[PDB]
Amino acid sequence: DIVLTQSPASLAVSLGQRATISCRASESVDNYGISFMNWFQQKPGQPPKLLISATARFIGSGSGTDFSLNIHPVEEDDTAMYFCQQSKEVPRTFGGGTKLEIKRTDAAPTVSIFPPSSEQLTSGGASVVCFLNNFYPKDINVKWKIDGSERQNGVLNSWTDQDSKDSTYSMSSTLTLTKDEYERHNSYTCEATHKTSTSPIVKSFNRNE
Amino acid sequence: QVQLQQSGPELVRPGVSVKISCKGSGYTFTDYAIHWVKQSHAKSLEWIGVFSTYYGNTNYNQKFKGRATMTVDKSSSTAYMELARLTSEDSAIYYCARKSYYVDYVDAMDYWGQGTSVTVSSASTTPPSVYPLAPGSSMVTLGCLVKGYFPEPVTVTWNSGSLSSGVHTFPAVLQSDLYTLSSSVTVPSSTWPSETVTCNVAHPASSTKVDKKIVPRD
């Protein structure tokens, strides 16, 4: 097969600036002056959408084995995965994708912590939920503390893709305990370390309140 | 408008086959071939093959080992793809796409179906438990925890879809053959609890719908 290698894996570009994404083919995808190369944009939850075929904000360039997609000017809704795809030979093949991130100003996460519902405790479980919403950049770490001691087991995290409107990220962290272990401790703390503050953001509750 | 409408999500046991459909509208279906594409995760698109709706000729990616069979019902403008002897490696979103030329002689995939999510698993269908997340007594953030269901998908809405801004519904996480997901909604503090906020959860696979009001803590 013709192998397509994209570079970089991800890039962050400011609004109005130029983004350049590379695709290298393992052999020529040209003949008769025609480049049999397409580009696709895939937004989360959506099918790929054809952007460019062969070689006005999206422009393809290149020849032989060397191709690139240029986006200019970059807009908020351009956050997406971008794929190259060759139609020079069967089987058709795709690159591994490049994530375009929109660079925006830093934004501190809005942190909210929730105790287990009475409904869940009745069935014998206890999930503590922490939402860390609308932050930028995407790098964040969440630490769970129980009575001041870090807890690692029972933590499950989920992240959103970058918001197509405000270019932020959100995260949900859930610490799941048994009702038995949960009722043996008093203080539960979601602790977030993010570029936006030197001190970690702390939200907590006490079970006995 | 050109539209390709695919069949719904499938949960299938290992070793069986699954047959998914792709119905075209808004164009002459037999004037365009149909591509099929597998997406096993966000950074993988793999071409399965291309089917001539007019002639019935097929060209397959050999990597599927002949396990894929492409057919058509011309009278209903519907293409089918059957994938046989399934394993967990076949769990993926499957797309159909129309073959067209935007540039002369260059095969492109120009309109795509919405995708069909196939889950290959022996695990049992299980309805979700829906837990409301209320804060104690600016903006207020409320939550909904949707726990212990299988398979995907669930749909979460707030106030039957009337609350759309300020919602974050997070990707589900699988553990021990059960999914958990959460959703938050942020609203003006003057609007809850003086007005009602409800989490609406639907789990089609278990034919379950649950509405849970977010009730202020007593």
Q: List the domain boundaries for chain A.
A: 1-104, 105-209
Q: Which residue of A has its CA nearest to B140?
A: A112
User: Hey, of B184, B186, B197, B211, which one would you mutate to test binding to chain A, going by the most A CBs within 10 A of its CB?
Assistant: B184
Q: Are residues B40 and B23 in the same domain?
A: yes
Query: B68 and B12 in contact (C-beta within 8 Å)?
Result: no
Q: Up-side HSE of residue B10: CA atoms within 13 Å toward CB?
A: 24
Report how this structure was experimentally obtained. X-ray
Deposited resolution, Å: 1.6
Per DSSP, the three-state class of B103 is: coil
Residue B86, domain extent: 2-122
**Cβ–Cβ of A96/B43 closer than 8 Å?**
yes
Place of tokens 């829906």: B130
* Amino acid making up residue B107: D
Q: Which of B135, B197, B213, B215 is nearest to A209 (CA)?
A: B135
* Amino acid making up residue B210: V
* Chain A residues touching B61 at Cβ < 8 A: 90-92
CATH assignment of the domain containing B191: 2.60.40.10
Among B100, B122, B144, the domain boundary falls at B122
Q: What's the angle, vertex CA A67, arms to CA A65 and CA A73, rounded to 5?
A: 175
**Parallel, antiparallel or unpaired: strands B116-120 and B10-12:** parallel
Total domains present in chain B: 2
**Cβ–Cβ of B180/A112 closer than 8 Å?**
no
Q: Which residue of B has its CA nearest to A133?
A: B168
| CATH code of the region A1-104 | 2.60.40.10
As its CATH architecture, domain A105-209 has Sandwich (2.60)
In sequence order, the β-bridge partners of residue A24 are A5, A66
Same fold, A1-104 and A105-209: yes
